[PDB]
Ligand binder design. Structure first.
Ligand SMILES: *C(CCC(=O)O)CC(C)=O
Ligand SMILES: *C(CCC(=O)O)CC(C)=O
Ligand SMILES: *C(CCC(=O)O)CC(C)=O
Ligand SMILES: *C(CCC(=O)O)CC(C)=O
Ligand SMILES: [Zn+2]
Ligand SMILES: [Zn+2]
Ligand SMILES: [Zn+2]
Lengths: 342, 342, 147, 342
């Protein structure tokens, strides 16, 4: 008869026993480097020039184009549940608005600056963050000033970027986050802020490690800046580019960045890890891109994973990889989930 | 008129310019720490006791229950395309087979050992890896010998595990990978192998960092060992448990592991990063669990990302995080994709 | 009878009490004695009692002798005097010993370490944060600091 | 009967035995990284414009407002007991003295510069240190030149600070310690000193890590610069700001600081620890702020701790955390305590 065999073993080595540290539910919390709090979430917003807008993108519940006139009733509840911050994305829909130099970027009458004045008044405790780029304002759609050759003209673009950034700060935005990727833009924005005597009031949250890939789908649909699928990648770091990513982090920090953002998040967890050592003194933020979040919804839909569970696992993943800040479309949800206790 | 402003900037610092290294397609390859080769893929197999089986699980194309009699025609093409290895998972379906001590685990007539003899003969170049656990053979389903109290009895289970492992090695398997998680099992298996005078022929590929979570869904459906949803987590590391994960890696390596596996993969990229430093001298393998792969398919289905693209991005992610080996259900595909060139 | 502490006897005694608490239902045991090697003996006892996988060993790895345990002594009734008979209590300037005690306890099975006092020993939690970088670190705001 | 149980134990491991190193009183001294000497203490002084002043603040024995005419009889004994240094704090009480630009800061006839000339003559061996700030001279009270907006104007303030610092040096002060916190002030003061051809004679003791908090109470009462309670915190580092503190240390050292000060002390011991690695080549000084010392007195009063004991424990704490210098109001006492021996 085939019988159950058992090998001859020695006494248990203490050094093999780790189970004493994670056998209780509360211990599973004790074991985490950092716990998830509501004041760690940054909710993204897509302001439309149509002050009466409210368009849902790709069926994703936390991705809408809202006009200033709907902003109150939408932000009201959120702030009530504990939302402490948001990152503004302008979507100028009015015809003949976009152009070669993204002039509308700092248009005092655009969705961004108008959104700032609104928030700064209807919600003075909220911390306003503004994404800085020319992609949603240039006729071509790229994140900068290109030559007739097509390529990006560093100097011109960067000089343009510093202008928009400083203008947002002047408008009342507490923080600026350039997602362009053009070399040296962080230094030029820091300088501009310095000369504008705003460097001591504006947090520079640089998109230090933004990789090109197959996960920005939804976002492109909503921000309208349509790069195709994945060919025209400006300063977007190749996915395998760990070396460049590490160098970009040391660069941006050296150029004035007060905090860095890694994105995508989930698919780049080892990168936040590297950042956690390089930028060990700076707040690290993870960006759960529109594609990752749209991916969680899909799988959940097909019942491949529970939505609420995979969100916690994924988000805690950010915290574990080294991040202490999180920009995510799941913010509305977490503002609820984080409460369920007591 | 709102005009496009441009700030006063200084001459470009060389140290800001990184674009010179990733502006060409071939350079994007030059920038990667390691390139993806076909001999890096480990295709998982689920052997059934019904020698004539061939059941597709959850609609996932690369997750099937195959009997020995279908194994040839299935492995034929794969090996032709370059498959160099597979990790065996036994699924005994015959009634009254499973029991309290997972006796059938090393059953010379079971799917695993029978699968080994088959492969070792019909495909002598293939490298055989066998997952070592009691979960798919115990009446209860857990990965070990539990007390009447329910809990796992370390000593008994581990002594049992070393037995099965050594028996697989004796059967002809080149490598054993214990996915249990019970403390000290690696040392007991190494010893058993040593005493069985097989330690110099069997690669011990330990599941050093296996986290409990919401991503093993599909696999449970196919391996039939049904832990519920996510409550009875044996030695499964809490997702936030980076400290424990780091300690488990140092432990397993110290206990004889010749290589380590991190799993899940994508959601634990920072962990392969940590492993890449801790186990800097050992091959690191990433396991693209059934749930992550089922997640890529879902999102692709809803057209959230291109399947072939997100697979390359995700898999290259493993290589970038430090891994040099990959166990994935996408192996059939990659064996094709990796070819398209010349 | 000499007054001094008998390591072997005491430690053997300590492992007994610890394991008994675990057997009673306590999830975690924290030995605040300071006697060398007690962590290993308690870990073993727990192992033999087949409780090592359910009991978190929260060792008082860095407990310094000093002028801050006043209140606590009044309440726990165990009255060492003022500050003379300090058993395995680390001298306040003893950073080296504190660092060694941390590596020892962790190596002996501790699942987490406690530093105490807290405030007056913040640089020590700092050292611990590197030494025991993989273990939960706990600070003890002693009765004297709070008072 | 409940009997005393004793577990079965193995032979003692040498590696568990540390007691051989601290079982004797002299060994407790042998174990310290550095011993406490009298020439390590810096006694603070608050000079008043009333040359005949002598006011005790908040009942704290070593916190008095003294005029030049009382300075001798007060410093006489102290220097006799071994005092080798003091840090000057000016308290101009004369009406209409303070203003918007802290003009009186380097007033050749003010308490500070007058105090320097006095000391330099009546006690030539004493090492004079001068705190550099505008807080005790500006009409508003803040440590710098503010805009009508209220905020601090970096450029103006810093340019002002370098002026005062260099003037103190010109007056005869051996060392300058800017406690402002304004970014870049260290570099501007170093430069000024360089241009004043005094950089090779003046030790720049920067307040690199000065945290805002609830411990400067007493001091505010005596220096008269009354920021409220704890709201208007200029460049004061948030208590949780370890990252910023680490960056500020690397900055000040890079800007010319010859030594750094950490403050508060006790409540920031881990910070001196960080400093001990960052500024491993520079003397590190701890500042036992007025609030910590007032706290020791209180607890001692209520008989919670012995004054003389907790002072030694706390102060040795500074030395252990990495400090080799100590600014404390307990200096008179220690100059006595350090003697009791032989
Ligand atoms: C990044 C986030 C895109 C997404 O959510 O899909 C926007 C940016 C780089 O500014
Ligand atoms: C791990 C892989 C599970 C999956 O593919 O979903 C199996 C194991 C831990 O043995
Ligand atoms: C430590 C705490 C004493 C106090 O709170 O004052 C007690 C112990 C060492 O067990
Ligand atoms: C710091 C010391 C304050 C105190 O003793 O309470 C004075 C300064 C920052 O110049
Ligand atoms: Zn852009
Ligand atoms: Zn198992
Ligand atoms: Zn000041």
């Amino acid at each position: 008869m085939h019988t159950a065999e058992f090998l001859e073993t020695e006494p248990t080595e203490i050094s093999s026993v780790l189970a004493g540290g994670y056998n209780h539910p509360l211990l599973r919390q004790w074991q985490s480097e950092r716990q998830l709090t509501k004041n760690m979430l940054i909710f993204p917003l897509f302001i439309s020039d149509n002050p009466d807008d409210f368009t849902e993108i790709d069926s994703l519940p936390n991705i809408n184009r809202i006009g200033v006139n709907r902003l109150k009733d939408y932000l009201k509840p959120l702030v009530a549940k504990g939302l402490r911050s948001v990152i503004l994305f302008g979507v100028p829909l009015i015809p003949g608005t976009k152009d070669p130099v993204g002039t509308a970027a700092d248009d005092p009458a655009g969705p961004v600056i108008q959104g700032i004045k609104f928030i700064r008044e209807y919600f003075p405790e909220l911390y306003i963050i503004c994404d800085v780029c020319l992609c949603e304002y240039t006729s071509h759609g790229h994140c900068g000033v290109l030559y007739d050759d097509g390529t990006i003209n560093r100097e011109r673009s960067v000089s343009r970027l510093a202008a928009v950034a400083v203008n947002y700060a002047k408008a009342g935005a507490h923080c600026v986050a350039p997602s362009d990727m053009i070399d040296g833009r962080i230094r030029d924005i820091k300088r501009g802020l310095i000369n504008a005597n705003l460097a001591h009031k504006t947090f520079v949250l640089s998109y230090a490690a933004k990789f090109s890939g197959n996960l920005y789908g939804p976002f492109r649909d909503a921000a309208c800046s349509a790069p195709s699928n994945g060919d025209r990648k400006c300063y977007q770091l190749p996915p395998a580019g760990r070396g460049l990513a590490r160098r970009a982090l040391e660069r941006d920090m050296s150029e004035g960045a007060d905090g860095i953002i890694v994105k995508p998040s989930t698919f780049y967890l080892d990168i936040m890890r590297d950042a956690s050592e390089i930028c060990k003194d700076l707040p690290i933020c993870a960006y759960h891109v529109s594609g990752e979040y749209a991916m969680l919804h899909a799988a959940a839909e097909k019942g491949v994973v529970d939505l609420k569970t995979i969100a916690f696992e994924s988000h805690q993943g950010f915290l574990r990889a080294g991040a202490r800040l999180i920009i995510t479309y799941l913010a509305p949800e977490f503002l609820d989930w984080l409460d369920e206790e007591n």
